[PDB]
């Protein structure tokens, strides 16, 4: 048993058979798995063919666009002490990582960046979704536009003295045209003043009615001084057709924030092709928990 | 021996764990999710059937 089944020397067997059998079974399995691999690779190549390089075949899942933010907060909470410097480092590292892509050195020369209206404007169409007129051109977005949250004056961006900033950003979607609400009698209260048609408004508030009083002055920084996104940076043509493309950003400073207390702040964008979802808490709006404990 | 044997025991655990996952959620977080409650309601039905 023990020995005879492992190796016998009369029939010249290992594990139960001689050798020729092992050679035939091994050869068969090698050829079989080779045919299987080849067929799988061919059926996957036909699929790599079917699709187009400039446009995803289905765009119903990423619509409408979301609303992400920097810093990178886990559980949507921004808690840091004004004394211990090693408390807001994970936040500043992220904020810096995001703003580090808008350096003027990167946006240099005529290509592939072109100058655009310093004031909000309308859409700009650079053609169809082809390779005919080569790489398209994207509008420049300067860092300095964000006034007190730019990392150029106060690298920390505010976390140093109990005045934090939040750089909001709209999710990039190919061929998506933002449509703001019109001046008709039906419009939220907030949006009435400064109705620049060319700007998509973003406005933050308090989740609960009580927290209203505990929240101070929400100071929005953006293109032209408005609290929104200029329509001129749309639409987006995709990575392949618009490499080196920069999406607008909006800075939000939560000045006069009550100390030692968790505040729930909900920011929300408004527009026609903008819709929220009770399941996805990042579709169009976003929630942040701020607690400047010092 | 049928509903509480040797392989179904592990499923009984899956169900327990998931229910605790929903309790800590509803007690703590405002407006929670429900994938855990339905996961428990499904697992229990499997052991029973």
């Amino acid at each position: 048993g023990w020995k005879k089944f492992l190796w016998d020397s009369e029939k010249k067997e290992f594990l139960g058979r001689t050798g020729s059998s092992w050679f035939k079974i091994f050869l068969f399995y090698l050829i079989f798995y080779g045919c299987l691999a080849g067929i799988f690779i061919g059926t996957i190549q036909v699929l790599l063919l079917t699709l187009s390089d400039f446009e995803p075949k289905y765009q119903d899942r990423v619509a409408p666009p979301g609303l992400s933010h920097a810093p990178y907060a886990i559980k949507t909470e921004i808690s840091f002490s004004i004394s211990n410097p090693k408390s807001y480092e994970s936040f500043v590292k992220s904020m810096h990582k995001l703003m580090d892509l808008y350096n003027e050195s990167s946006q240099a020369g005529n290509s592939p960046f072109e100058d655009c209206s310093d004031t909000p404007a309308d859409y700009i169409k650079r053609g169809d979704l082809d390779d005919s007129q080569g790489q398209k051109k994207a509008c420049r977005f300067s860092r300095m536009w964000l006034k007190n949250c730019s990392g150029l004056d106060d690298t920390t961006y505010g976390y140093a003295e109990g005045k934090p900033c939040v750089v909001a950003k709209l999710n990039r979607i190919i061929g998506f045209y933002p449509k703001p609400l019109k001046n008709t009698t039906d419009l939220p209260e907030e949006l009435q003043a400064n109705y620049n048609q060319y700007v998509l408004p973003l406005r933050c508030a308090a989740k609960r009615e009580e927290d209203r009083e505990k929240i101070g002055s929400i100071e929005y920084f953006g293109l032209g001084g408005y609290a929104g996104f200029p329509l001129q940076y749309y639409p987006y043509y995709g990575k392949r057709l618009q490499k080196k493309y920069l999406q607008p950003l909006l800075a939000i400073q939560f000045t006069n924030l009550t100390q030692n207390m968790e505040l729930r702040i909900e920011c929300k964008v408004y527009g026609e092709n903008i819709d929220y979802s009770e399941k996805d808490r990042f579709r169009g709006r976003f929630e942040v928990k701020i607690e400047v404990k010092s | 021996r049928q509903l509480f044997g040797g392989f179904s025991i592990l499923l009984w655990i899956g169900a327990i764990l998931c229910f605790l996952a929903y309790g800590i959620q509803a007690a703590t977080e405002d407006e929670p999710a429900n994938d855990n409650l339905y996961l428990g309601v499904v697992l229990s039905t499997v052991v029973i059937v």
Binding site: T43, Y58, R61, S68, K279 | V42
Partner: protein
């Protein structure tokens, strides 16, 4: 024993290759209860192949029920094919929604992070957390259907081990009942309005149902030839190796 391979391979590539999970818990439970309960029971009721009395008796010492050949056919040959069949539907769903195959190796770490709402796909778009989880669930449902489709073939080839199905015939009614019923279970769970909230299955588009068809025909044709060679050459290599 054949369905074991497609349920384990996803958890293997997921951990090793670091890709999004192809099969989940609810979908796996659906596979076990659907394609393995009724079709299996139907097999018991099968009729006898002509050959039953035209074959020598058996020596219990030399011929056992579970020998090294059953695992060869189920795990090794048929199984790996059902696994490839499900992987194709998975790759197709992702490629069409924007995520290609080359970019998928390593996205798990980032994919499973509820906090990165900025996930970027191949075409450069930025995806939130539930927007990408929805596509992953559409892959779970497709995998499930690809499994039922390949099961069709596995079940048909299981009716006979020496004769063809053209010889044996499709006179078993319970087996037919099983084929129609399983297909119905998959269509019902994928299209019903509310499974989304409760079971986490999403509707499947029409061009996807067919992804598993080539792998379903290959299994049937392979077994048919595998048998012709047996009938013609007794005591050959095929009978020594694959006849269970």
């Amino acid at each position: 024993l054949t369905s074991n391979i497609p349920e384990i391979t996803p958890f293997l590539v997921f951990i090793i290759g670091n890709v999004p999970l192809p099969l989940g818990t609810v979908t796996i439970l659906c596979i076990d209860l659907g394609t393995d309960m009724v079709p299996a029971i139907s097999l018991a009721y099968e009729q006898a192949e002509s050959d039953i009395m035209k074959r020598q008796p058996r020596n219990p010492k030399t011929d056992k029920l579970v020998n090294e050949r059953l695992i060869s056919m189920a795990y090794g040959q048929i199984g790996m094919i059902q696994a490839l069949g499900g992987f194709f539907s998975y790759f197709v769903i992702l490629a069409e929604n924007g995520f290609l195959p080359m970019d998928l190796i390593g996205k798990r770490v980032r994919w499973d992070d509820r906090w990165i709402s900025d996930v970027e796909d191949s075409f450069g778009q930025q995806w939130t957390y539930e927007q990408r989880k929805i596509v992953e669930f559409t892959c779970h449902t497709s995998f499930f259907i690809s499994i039922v489709v390949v099961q069709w073939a596995d079940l048909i080839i299981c009716k006979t081990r020496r004769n063809s199905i053209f010889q044996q015939g499709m006179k078993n009614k319970i087996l037919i009942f099983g084929l129609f019923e399983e297909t119905a279970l998959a269509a019902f769970l994928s299209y019903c309005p509310g499974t989304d909230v409760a079971l986490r299955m999403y509707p499947l588009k029409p061009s996807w149902w067919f992804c598993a068809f080539p792998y379903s025909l290959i299994i049937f044709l392979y077994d048919e030839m595998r048998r012709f060679i047996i009938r013609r050459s007794p005591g050959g290599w095929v009978e020594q190796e694959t006849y269970y």
